[PDB]
Amino acid sequence: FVHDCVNITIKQHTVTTTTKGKNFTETDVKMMERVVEQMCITQ
Amino acid sequence: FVHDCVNITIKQHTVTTTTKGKNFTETDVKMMERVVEQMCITQ
Amino acid sequence: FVHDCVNITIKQHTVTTTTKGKNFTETDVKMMERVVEQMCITQ
Amino acid sequence: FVHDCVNITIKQHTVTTTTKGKNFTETDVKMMERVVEQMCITQ
Amino acid sequence: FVHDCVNITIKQHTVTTTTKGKNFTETDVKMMERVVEQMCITQ
Amino acid sequence: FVHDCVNITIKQHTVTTTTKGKNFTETDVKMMERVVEQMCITQ
């Protein structure tokens, strides 16, 4: 009944901004309303 | 009944902006309303 | 009934900004309304 | 050399919003970079 | 050399908002970088 | 060399907000960098 579960995620980044009136600059983003996340289930 | 589950995701990036009145610049983004994510299930 | 659960995430970043009236600059962000997260379940 | 200068501007409005994740709703707006406005000149 | 200068501006408004995550709602707004405004000049 | 200078501006408003995470709601606003405003000049 053996399972296994692995996940790697390296996220390198470098932002820069010089605004003159308006700027938002939202980097990597998510949103999940009724999220139900799981992993390695053996019901 | 053996399973296995692997997933890697490296995400290198470098943004830059010099606005003069309006700018948004949203990098890698997602959204999932009623998300139900799983992995390595053996019901 | 053996399981296993691993996940690594290194997140290097370096932001900089010199505004002249408005700027937001929100780096990596998420939001999950009715989140129910789990890991390595063997019900 | 008589002049005259009149200008009226009534601006009635009524906004409303019920957001669920993003909304801007900028009402009557302007912007003028090197503006040089005058009135009733008799050089 | 007579001049005259008049200007009226009544601005009635009524905003309302019920946000659920993000909202800006900027009402009547302006911006003028190197503005030089005058009135009733007789150089 | 007679001049005259008049300007009236009544500004009635009524805002209201019930936020659930973020909200800005900036009412009538301006900004003028190198502003040089005058009135009724007879150089």
Numbering used by the authors:
A (entry chain E), B (entry chain F), C (entry chain D), D (entry chain C), E (entry chain B), F (entry chain A): 175 to 217
What do the paper's sentences say?
We produced amyloid fibrils from recombinant, full-length human E196K PrPC (residues 23 to 231) overexpressed in Escherichia coli, by incubating the purified protein in 20 mM tris-HCl buffer (pH 7.4) containing 2 M guanidine hydrochloride and shaking at 37°C for 7 to 9 hours. The 3D map showed two protofibrils in the E196K fibril intertwined into a left-handed helix, with a half-helical pitch of 126.4 nm, which is remarkably longer than that of the wild-type fibril. The subunits in each E196K protofibril stack along the fibril axis with a helical rise of 4.82 Å and twist of −0.68°, and the subunits in two protofibrils stack along the fibril axis with a helical rise of 2.41 Å. The E196K fibril core features a compact fold containing a long β strand (β1) and four short β strands (β2 to β5). In contrast, the E196K fibril core contains a long β sheet (β1), four short β sheets (β2-β5), a long interface comprising residues 194 to 208, and one disulfide bond between Cys179 in β1 and Cys214 in β5, with a higher β sheet content (77%) than in the wild-type fibril core (55%). Four pairs of amino acids (Lys194 and Glu207; Lys196 and Glu200; Glu200 and Lys196; and Glu207 and Lys194) from opposing subunits of the E196K fibril formed four strong intermolecular salt bridges, with a distance of 3.1, 3.4, 3.4, and 3.0 Å, respectively, and Glu207 and Arg208 from the same subunit of the E196K fibril formed two weak salt bridges, with a distance of 6.3 Å, to stabilize the mixed hydrophilic and hydrophobic protofibril interface. Lys185 and Asp202 from the same subunit of the E196K fibril formed two strong salt bridges, and His187 and Asp202 from the adjacent subunit of the E196K fibril formed two salt bridges to stabilize the two hydrophilic cavities. In this case, the charge-flipping mutation of Glu to Lys at position 196 disrupts key interactions in the wild-type fibril structure and induces a rearrangement of its core.
